[PDB]
């Protein structure tokens, strides 16, 4: 299983760590320095995000997002060999990012914005499709499912169809159940517990649980006290064959993933279920 | 539903338990303070031994081992509700430990010293059977065969199967690939229908993989603990209790959301 972009490939025969590079508010210098620490810690993908997708967040203008994100994507693509995912919903950010070297479009809205689907298709880049109920402004008010796994799974069916029909080949797609995006605690753990069952699509799985409420609410601790919980989440996901793990704490996660890889390669079928 | 019974209390093995490692080196005050810290971090068992009971540590006389071990076990038993695991191979220490409140006999030698088997049987206490001998044809099958034999050996000495715990003994005459093969197939040891205990904390199976020293192995230790607990391991022996307890609560939330309650 591989992805292809900007004349390189990403080998998904083992898990990859994706370092989080938040550029919501010298910012260019610091971002490049942070990217560098994460690369040295073993991150093979950097996720550059210029719009807060947190519960309650206000939208960011196209002009603000471009200014925050494009110089950062460019600088990294110029200096390092690492892959770059862009955490955006905007057609113009999608277009400009591809032009300065981004490898993956990571859209929490699964290209739902007017023009986003067509822009993503024109770039030819890999596209991550994430599940969210509602939108970031109200998703966490009262998340509700009869069956969270089935509803997330149905959603991936439809979005894969939607993408294929715009001329995005299945082989460019990644799936992400969207931990925290319109989900209470028990919804999140139902998804994590059944994560291996999303392999039926035969597509890369991407997960982001790092320092999120599904850890905080379980342990009753703030964002800075969540590393152990985050590693546990990462290991649980990678033990079930998750291909990319989106995290804040790269070094610790990479060490944990090495242990998982040694375990999985000793196994005769290469995955837990 | 799995439970152990000892010293008028019980251990509920429907979820995983973190066992904290206690170094025995006044020293009694310090041991109790360290027990307190691990209990407050959420350990429900304390394993009395640590550095002094590691492989290669200096052997001690019966008299010395009683003087260092018995007062510690007694002190914890008087002050806390926590279960107490005792690291010993000597029948006298097994006997005296039981008299002052120990709950589990954790002998890395599987009661092989003269009299140790008979002493453990007289206590009525739970006993951990750990594999130790690196070369194997099939490391899992050798370890598995070893459990069959030690289970029988204990049953024959009058120790009921319900008092036994099984430990594959990570790092004990095992190279890196042997250790990871055991960890990869840990769930298969559930066919004995006995508790599984594992100890990977800060071991060379992490140090050699990551190429880091003993104080830099927390992330790998946590990964190992999570991998074992996701496969239904019941007791996890560790140095870093708080962090392990936190990882275990994540594992519990995950296993509670599953219909099957274990990964394989
Ligand atoms: C502290 N919370 C955050 O980091 C929220 S931002 C964010 N989360 C995710 C995620 O779970 N998956 C993907 N693909 N992209 C994401 N972007
Ligand atoms: C840094 N190395 C150590 O902690 C070696 S001492 C030790 N290991 C184990 C183990 O794996 N299982 C049990 N039951 N008892 C043990 N005692």
**Coil vs helix vs strand at B5:** strand
d(CA A3, CA A15): 13
**Number of residues assigned to chain B:** 264
Q: Which of A172, A183, A212, A226 is catalytic?
A: A212
Separation CA A170–CA A161 (nearest Å): 9
What tokens were used for A256?
């944990």
Can you tell me the distance from the alpha carbon of A246 to that of A233, in angstroms, rounded to the nearest whole number?
A: 11
**Is residue B53 marked as binding?**
yes
Question: Is residue A246 annotated as part of the catalytic site, yes or no?
Answer: yes
Residues 6+ apart with CB under 8 A from B214: B202, B207
SS3 B263: coil
Which of A74, A69, A76, A73 is closest to A90 using CA atoms?
A69
Are residues A88 and A43 in contact, defined by beta-carbon separation less than 8 angstroms?
Answer: no
What residue has token string 């603990």? B225
Q: If DSSP codes are grouped into helix, strand and coil, which group holds residue B102?
A: coil
For residue B203, the domain's CATH number is: 3.20.20.20
Both structure tokens of B134: 């690196």
The number of angstroms, rounded, from the C-alpha of B124 to the middle of its chain's C-alpha atoms is 18
Task: Say whether A233 sits in a helix, a strand or coil.
Answer: helix
Report the DSSP beta bridge partners of residue A18: A45, A246
Q: Please identify which residue in the block is written with the tokens 């994507």.
A: A73
Q: Which of B109, B106, B174, B113 is nearest to B140 (CA)?
A: B174
Residues of chain B positioned with their CB less than 8 A from the CB of A219? 246, 249
Tokens read off for B70: 């018995």
How far off is chain A from B135, nearest CA to CA, in Å?
16
What is the distance between the terminal CA atoms of chain A, rounded to a whole angstrom? 19
Residue position matching structure tokens 């892959």: A83
In angstroms, rounded to a whole number, what is the distance separating the alpha carbons of residues A270 and A261? 9
According to the entry, how was the structure determined? X-ray
| Chain A residue at shortest CA distance from B230 | A236
Contact B261, B234 (CB under 8 A): no
CA distance A86 to A66: 11
Q: Is the dihedral of CA B244, B164, B7, B114 positive or negative?
A: negative
CB B191 within 8 A of CB B166: no
Sheet containing A83-87: give its strands across: A173-176, A127-130, A104-107, A83-87, A45-49, A16-22, A244-247, A206-207
- Can you tell me which residue has the tokens 């204990």? B154
Structure tokens belonging to residue B110: 């599987």
Half-sphere exposure of A263 (CA within 13 A, CB side): 31
How many Å separate Cα B195 from the centre of its chain?
A: 11
**How far apart (Å, rounded) are the C-alpha atoms in residues B177 and B69?**
35
CA of A52 to the centre of ligand 1 (A): 9
The three-class DSSP label of residue A229 is helix
Question: Beta partners for A247?
Answer: A19
Radius of gyration of chain A (CA): 17
Task: Report CB contact under 8 Å: A258, B220.
Answer: yes
Q: Residue ranges of the alpha helices (H) in B175-235?
A: 176-184, 204-210, 218-230
d(C-alpha A83, C-alpha A130), whole Å:
19
Mutate to test the interface with B, among A17, A179, A209, A236 (most CBs of B within 10 A): A236
Please name the member of B220, B250, B263 whose beta carbon is closest to the beta carbon of A232: B250
Cα distances (angstroms) measured from residue A201 to each of A161, A182, B131 = 12, 23, 42
CA A227, CA A215: separation in Å to the nearest integer?
Answer: 9
Alpha-carbon gap, residue B162 to B151, rounded angstroms: 10
Q: H helices within B91-175, ranges in order?
A: 91-99, 116-123, 139-156
Q: Using the 8-state DSSP alphabet, how is residue B59 labeled?
A: P
Q: How far apart are CA B188 and CA B70, in angstroms?
A: 37
Q: Which residues of B are catalytic, by number?
A: 203, 237
Q: Are A256 and B230 an interchain contact pair (Cβ–Cβ within 8 Å)?
A: no
Query: Nearest-CA neighbor of A104 among A44, A27, A35, A32?
Result: A44
Angstrom distance (rounded) from CA A39 to CA A250: 9
Nearest CA to ligand 1 atom 12: A208
Residue B189: alpha-carbon gap to chain centroid: 16
Count the neighbouring beta carbons within 10 Å of the beta carbon of residue A41.
16
How far is it, in rounded angstroms, from Cα A239 to Cα A235? 6
CA dihedral B129, B131, B132, B133 (to 10 degrees): 130
Q: What's the resolution in A? A: 2.0
Query: Quick count: other Cβ atoms within 10 Å of Cβ B211?
Result: 8
Q: List the beta bridge partners of residue B183.
A: none
Beta bridge partners of B167: B130
* A229 chain-B contacts, CB cut-off 8 A: 246-247, 249-250
Say whether B89 sits in a helix, a strand or coil: coil
How many structural domains compose chain A? 1
* DSSP reduced 3-state for A185: helix
Binding-site residues, ligand 2, Cβ < 6 A? B 54, 106, 108, 128, 130, 167, 169-170, 197, 199, 202-203, 237
The encoded tokens of residue A177 equal 């159940």
Per the structure, the complete domain to which residue B107 belongs is given by 1-264
Q: Rounded to an integer, what distance in angstroms lies between the CA atom of residue B227 and that of residue B183?
A: 8
Q: Ligand 2 atom 8: the closest Cα is on which residue?
A: B199
Question: Position of tokens 């290669």?
Answer: B56
């Amino acid at each position: 299983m591989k992805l292809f972009a900007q004349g390189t490939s990403l080998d998904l025969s083992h898990p990859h760590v994706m370092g989080i590079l938040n550029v919501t508010p010298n910012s260019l210098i610091d971002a490049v320095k942070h990217a560098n620490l994460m690369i040295n810690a073993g991150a093979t993908i950097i996720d550059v995000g210029g719009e807060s997708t947190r519960p309650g967040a206000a939208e960011v203008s196209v002009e603000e997002e471009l200014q925050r994100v494009i110089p950062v994507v460019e600088a990294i693509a110029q200096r390092f060999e690492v892959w770059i995912s862009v955490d955006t919903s905007k057609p113009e950010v999608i277009r400009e990012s591809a032009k300065v070297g981004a490898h993956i479009i990571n859209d929490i809205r699964s290209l739902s914005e007017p023009g986003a689907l067509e822009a993503a298709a024109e770039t030819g880049l890999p596209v991550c499709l994430m599940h969210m109920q509602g939108n970031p402004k109200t998703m966490q008010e009262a998340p509700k499912y009869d069956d969270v796994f089935a509803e997330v799974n149905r959603y991936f069916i439809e979005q894969i169809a939607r993408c294929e029909q715009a001329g995005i080949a299945k082989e460019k797609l990644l799936l992400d159940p969207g931990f925290g995006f319109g989900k209470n605690l028990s919804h999140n753990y139902s998804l994590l517990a059944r994560l291996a069952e999303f392999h039926h699509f035969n597509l890369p799985l991407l997960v982001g649980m790092s320092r999120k409420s599904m850890i905080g609410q379980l342990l009753n601790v703030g964002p800075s006290e969540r590393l152990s919980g985050s590693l546990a989440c990462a290991v649980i996901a990678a033990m079930q064959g998750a291909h990319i793990i989106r995290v804040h704490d790269v070094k610790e996660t990479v060490e944990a993933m090495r242990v998982v890889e040694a375990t999985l390669s000793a196994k005769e079928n290469k995955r837990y279920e």
